[PDB]
Amino acid sequence: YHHIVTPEAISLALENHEFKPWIQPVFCAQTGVLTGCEVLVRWEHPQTGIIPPDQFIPLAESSGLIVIMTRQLMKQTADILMPVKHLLPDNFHIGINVSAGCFLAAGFEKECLNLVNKLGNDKIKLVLELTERNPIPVTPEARAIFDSLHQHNITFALDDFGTGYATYRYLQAFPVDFIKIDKSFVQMASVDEISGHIVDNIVELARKPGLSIVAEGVETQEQADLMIGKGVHFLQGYLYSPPVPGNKFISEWVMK
Amino acid sequence: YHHIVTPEAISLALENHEFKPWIQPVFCAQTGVLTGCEVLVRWEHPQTGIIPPDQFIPLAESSGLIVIMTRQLMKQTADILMPVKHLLPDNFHIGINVSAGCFLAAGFEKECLNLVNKLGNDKIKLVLELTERNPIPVTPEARAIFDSLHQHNITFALDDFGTGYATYRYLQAFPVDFIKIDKSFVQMASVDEISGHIVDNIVELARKPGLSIVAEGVETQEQADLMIGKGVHFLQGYLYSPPVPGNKFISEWVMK
Ligand SMILES: Nc1nc2c(ncn2[C@@H]2O[C@@H]3COP(=O)(O)O[C@H]4[C@@H](O)[C@H](n5cnc6c(=O)[nH]c(N)nc65)O[C@@H]4COP(=O)(O)O[C@H]3[C@H]2O)c(=O)[nH]1
Ligand SMILES: Nc1nc2c(ncn2[C@@H]2O[C@@H]3COP(=O)(O)O[C@H]4[C@@H](O)[C@H](n5cnc6c(=O)[nH]c(N)nc65)O[C@@H]4COP(=O)(O)O[C@H]3[C@H]2O)c(=O)[nH]1
Ligand SMILES: OC[C@H]1CC[C@H](O)CC1
Ligand SMILES: OC[C@H]1CC[C@H](O)CC1
Ligand SMILES: [Ca+2]
Ligand SMILES: [Ca+2]
Ligand SMILES: [Ca+2]
Ligand SMILES: [Ca+2]
Numbered sequence: 259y260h261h262i263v264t265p266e267a268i269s270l271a272l273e274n275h276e277f278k279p280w281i282q283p284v285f286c287a288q289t290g291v292l293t294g295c296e297v298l299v300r301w302e303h304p305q306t307g308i309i310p311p312d313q314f315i316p317l318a319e320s321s322g323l324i325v326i327m328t329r330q331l332m333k334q335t336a337d338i339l340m341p342v343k344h345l346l347p348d349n350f351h352i353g354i355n356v357s358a359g360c361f362l363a364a365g366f367e368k369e370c371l372n373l374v375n376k377l378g379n380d381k382i383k384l385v386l387e388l389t390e391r392n393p394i395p396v397t398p399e400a401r402a403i404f405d406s407l408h409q410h411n412i413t414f415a416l417d418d419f420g421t422g423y424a425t426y427r428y429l430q431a432f433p434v435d436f437i438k439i440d441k442s443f444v445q446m447a448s449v450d451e452i453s454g455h456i457v458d459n460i461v462e463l464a465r466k467p468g469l470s471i472v473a474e475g476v477e478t479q480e481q482a483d484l485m486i487g488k489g490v491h492f493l494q495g496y497l498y499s500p501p502v503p504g505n506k507f508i509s510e511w512v513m514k
Numbered sequence: 515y516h517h518i519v520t521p522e523a524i525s526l527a528l529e530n531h532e533f534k535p536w537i538q539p540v541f542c543a544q545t546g547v548l549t550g551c552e553v554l555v556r557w558e559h560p561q562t563g564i565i566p567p568d569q570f571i572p573l574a575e576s577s578g579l580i581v582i583m584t585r586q587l588m589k590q591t592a593d594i595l596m597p598v599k600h601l602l603p604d605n606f607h608i609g610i611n612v613s614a615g616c617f618l619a620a621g622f623e624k625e626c627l628n629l630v631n632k633l634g635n636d637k638i639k640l641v642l643e644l645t646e647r648n649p650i651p652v653t654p655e656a657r658a659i660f661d662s663l664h665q666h667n668i669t670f671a672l673d674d675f676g677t678g679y680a681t682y683r684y685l686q687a688f689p690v691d692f693i694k695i696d697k698s699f700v701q702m703a704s705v706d707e708i709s710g711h712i713v714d715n716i717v718e719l720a721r722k723p724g725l726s727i728v729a730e731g732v733e734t735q736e737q738a739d740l741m742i743g744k745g746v747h748f749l750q751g752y753l754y755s756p757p758v759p760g761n762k763f764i765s766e767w768v769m770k
Contacts, residue, residue, distance in 0.1 A: 259522070
């Protein structure tokens with residue numbers, strides 16, 4: 259078959275609450291312990307099964323529907339974690355992918371605070387994951403939103419570090435708290451006379467005062483060893499677990 | 515807008531010859547003259563319009579249908595250029611994206627030769643664009659195909675340079691003739707204290723093989739200037755032209 263995703267299809271799916279948060283664990287690189295997670299959206303379409311984000315997020319962004327989607331994902335994430343919030347490790351980080359439209363929408367900050375207040379400000383840390391692809395623009399208006407969120411104890415990550423066109427300029431405007439190295443670099447062989455120099459360079463550029471580095475996309479122990487050896491702070495990847503449904507995240511990570 | 519497609523849908527589209535070669539011009543960095551092109555597939559679906567490769571190539575590759583697709587694209591490319599082959603610049607390069615399945619299929623080399631023989635061996639140069647993503651495996655069998663194609667005056671490019679896990683190893687197994695710097699790096703701002711150091715590093719690593727370098731994805735004169743100044747040999751990008759249909763490529767680039 260040939261299914262076509264249009265704004266009308268996404269909008270109906272939102273009405274039916276078919277966009278679910280799946281969750282991928284994040285770990286301390288030095289101790290191996292659970293420190294957090296990233297929420298990754300999945301469209302659980304009753305007739306066709308699970309549709310991944312690459313087959314709808316870009317249209318959700320250009321149509322504006324992402325705003326409603328992310329609002330639902332944040333409510334649902336809170337609903338999943340509320341019953342086990344007392345079992346989470348202290349300072350448990352929750353990563354939410356935030357596109358430019360979401361960030362700039364009126365009431366965004368109130369939705370962030372609502373998630374934090376449900377789970378416990380003393381307990382979790384909300385991490386808003388931003389990207390240089392189709393980015394938040396550098397305006398005083400955008401920086402004011404960013405600063406207000408920071409003042410309310412919300413933090414930020416930069417996704418896909420090493421792939422952006424003007425990353426220093428971006429970080430100047432949006433001084434985030436975490437740098438997530440793009441998976442492409444995380445998976446490069448240290449011994450390779452080309453690729454080992456690339457990942458070396460990217461990781462060195464990522465070392466900035468106060469910024470914690472997350473190596474995302476770790477698939478093998480040898481990738482993990484390279485990142486650990488470079489003093490990266492957090493690890494995320496298929497080696498540990500792909501993203502899983504809420505209940506499975508609770509059963510396999512919060513409880514283990 | 516997002517098309518969720520099955521092997522059965524691709525196969526029917528191949529039966530209907532709906533996969534068309536679009537063509538993007540490539541230029542000499544020093545003189546600005548037309549030197550070649552890259553063929554980029556477009557699914558011209560009669561009911562829904564033009565579907566880009568990101569919404570079907572990966573399934574074409576995993577299903578095996580890419581083999582038939584590329585065979586069609588090569589025949590069609592020859593059919594487009596045959597009527598104007600005498601008007602092409604001498605040594606006109608034709609870049610064809612070749613996935614692992616295509617490369618390894620019996621009769622691949624004969625399909626390459628058929629294209630070359632139609633357009634003229636002393637006239638064009640067929641360039642097979644390979645990628646480290648889902649790559650040809652490093653086996654004696656694979657290297658024998660690669661060598662035989664080289665002995666028949668066919669050449670190779672490495673796509674997406676700067677993104678592969680073990681690029682030196684890859685080039686040692688598959689000693690290509692051109693390096694294409696990935697667009698992500700070509701578009702980095704030289705003045706950026708992060709991104710300028712990344713593109714600097716990637717371009718210096720791209721010299722290491724001592725091959726011709728193509729900068730793809732050039733969108734601004736400043737990107738072009740950075741690449742020209744670094745001694746890159748060829749330029750390709752929206753600054754000059756996006757990929758266009760065959761007739762338009764002939765009318766706008768081949769002809770004057
Ligand atoms: N091969 C491999 N892949 C790994 C590994 N570890 C993690 N990943 C995948 O890498 C992606 C990480 O998220 P991302 O870079 O922000 O990249 C994300 C993000 O840009 C976007 N996205 C996902 N969820 C959301 C969302 O709720 N909102 C928005 N605006 N974008 C989202 O979709 C992209 C793709 O998401 P997913 O398909 O869920 O793909 C996810 C994740 O499952 C690994 O070890 N190996
Ligand atoms: N933003 C921007 N983009 C530019 C610019 N100049 C060129 N591009 C785009 O960058 C891509 C370059 O091809 P690629 O990296 O091999 O990346 C290709 C290639 O991996 C694959 N693909 C395309 N045609 C074929 C094919 O016939 N066979 C196979 N196996 N893969 C193909 O799909 C990918 C995407 O192709 P396209 O969507 O046609 O996208 C093309 C091209 O239109 C620029 O200045 N700005
Ligand atoms: O657990 C550490 C956290 C690092 C920031 C990332 O964005 C989410 C997880
Ligand atoms: O025109 C020069 C050619 C360089 C190799 C590329 O793969 C296509 C164009
Ligand atoms: Ca992310
Ligand atoms: Ca990533
Ligand atoms: Ca290519
Ligand atoms: Ca590329």
